[PDB]
A paper describes a structure:
Repeat proteins are composed of an asymmetric structural motif that is concatenated several times in tandem within a single protein chain. From these building blocks, we demonstrate that a wide range of unbounded fibres can be systematically designed by introducing hydrophilic surface patches that force staggering of the monomers; the geometry of such fibres can be precisely tuned by varying the number of repeat units in the monomer and the placement of the hydrophilic patches. All multiplexes follow the naming convention CsHRN_Rr where s is the cyclic symmetry, HR stands for helical repeat, R is the number of repeats in a single chain and N is an index to differentiate between multiplexes of the same symmetry.
We determined the high-resolution structures of five designs from C2 to C6 symmetry by X-ray crystallography, cryogenic electron microscopy (cryoEM) or both. [name] matches the design model with an overall C-alpha r.m.s.d. of 2.11 Å and has a Vr of 12.6, higher than that of the other designs, further suggesting that all 12 designs are close to the correct structure.
Author numbering:
A (entry chain I): 593 to 739
B (entry chain A): 1 to 147
C (entry chain E): 297 to 443
D (entry chain C): 149 to 295
E (entry chain G): 445 to 591
């Protein structure tokens, strides 16, 4: 966090890339397990002018989203907070693919399809539900209640 | 949290929207991942007199509820604490829709149908239980034990 | 919690029931999302001398149990630590209801049926297993292994 | 924890069994929901010489495992760290019983069978796999891959 | 961890291998139950010049991975952060065996199938999907949507 990025800054000013790389990598790993650091380190990576660190952190958080739906909501909001067309495409794909095998996401998506009301989102979701409903009766009654 | 609240307030009394926007957005992002911060970020949003921040934070916590059932009690109690006709509507709806596909919430709904003891709630939950038990024998055993 | 405790104390010496409601409500909500505060706010309510906040906290944590099985052990032990015939009945009921649809609890209760060894517990558990085994084939193997 | 430690030490030094018992019960309850304190409080149980506190804490942290697999790995390592025959006997039973209903453990056991390499472990677990695999189709593929 | 780190580093310079064993087991057990300490306890183990503590911590964290999918992503990054040929070998097998019985992992591996693009890993994933899809319709719809 704050002390790690401060040491990072001072080491980069001193030089010694062999130390700076390890400080950066430990920040990256701490960002994986402690998610409230993700919003920090990410915005740090942009400020240093390092596209590689920023892109790798985007990667880490995006593929961490598929194993932790709270981080999925985080990245789904962050996609709009940045206004990026890589985040806003790949998150809105991993979500509309993860909904198939994780069934509470199949309700988060149904709430987004009215809070955002995206036409393409709704037209995808209707097909998701119609494909699921014939092989999963709980999804059938879910389609009954959502109307 | 305390530091971001202090920063936002001090910026607000000295102006310079370009800093206020960034601090506010980072605070919302932090609140997405740290639910303990939410009850703070919400109230501060009300204090500034900006219904837009407060409304977006209600949005964030509400759609966070459908992917983290710990928050589903937080917002459920917060609806009574505020007495807002949206929270009391949409939170009740996402419960009586999420119960279809996540039975830990189904038992929570069965407990609410007596701790609040609302007639409209129980008489609707009867339909959920019937439609599930008709096509899923485990929920039929649940209906047997809960009666 | 310490700041909220101090604020509640300073509010109590001078009235201001609106301040009391605000601080107490923030304590209640903080207790919903940070379970290690549950035991604190519970007893602070008791020493303060208000049956209503105490019973509301008993409600909040009890219905939080059915959505977070880590708090289930907390309330199950706190029932005996208090000796309250309310907790010791309602928790011993939500377990023998929640086990029907959640199968990790179905081997938590089976540990109580020997570490407490109650006849009621063992009899009810035998009934639960006999009902589930004919409609959930996997649990049949459980009935074979728990021999 | 340090505050509760100082309070219990002062209570022991004076000889006020009521305050000491109460604060120890509060510590026990705190240990239920903040598991990174368990190995601490357990140790304190050995420090005071209270075999009863030691046994109750062993019970709490053991039956907490069947609802939180992180505590399951904790107690699984702690059984070897202590060398207690009850911990080593009973964790290697609640695990080989929890595996039947929770499939994430079914690839935690399968890693122990080689990292600890116990002959009895593998010879017992073969029965679990062969019983599940004929009544749960995914386990058939799980057995096809792990061979 | 920093306090236990300091105590251990002091004990290393004054002997008393029993004190060292004690602080070591303290750090190890704290690491199992609070994952953000792992990357710390690992690196210190390497710095002291004790391959055995480092190997034990690798064991513990890899074993914890199969019951905590966030540590799965942690070790999945750490594998290439070190470059070691056990993590890169064994993590890429506990994952491609855990995916069989965990539906969220089946949409984590499918992102790596392009984020690293390993042809043999893509073939492994196709084999997993083809085996699952004929005995689990959810996976059939997942295969349909993924293309």
């Amino acid at each position: 966090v704050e002390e790690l990025k401060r040491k990072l800054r001072q080491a980069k000013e001193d030089g010694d890339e062999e130390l700076l790389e390890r400080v950066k990598n430990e920040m990256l790993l701490l960002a994986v397990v402690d998610p409230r650091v993700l919003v920090e380190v990410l915005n740090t990576a942009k400020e240093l002018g390092d596209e590689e660190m920023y892109k790798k952190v985007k990667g880490i958080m995006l593929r961490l989203a598929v194993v932790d739906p709270r981080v999925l909501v985080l990245v789904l909001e962050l996609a709009e907070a940045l206004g990026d067309e890589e985040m806003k495409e790949k998150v809105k794909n991993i979500m509309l693919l993860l909904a198939v095998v994780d069934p509470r996401v199949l309700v988060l998506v149904l709430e987004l399809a009215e809070e955002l009301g995206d036409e393409e989102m709704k037209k995808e979701v209707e097909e998701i539900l119609d494909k699921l409903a014939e092989v999963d009766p709980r999804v059938a009654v879910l389609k009954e209640v959502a109307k």
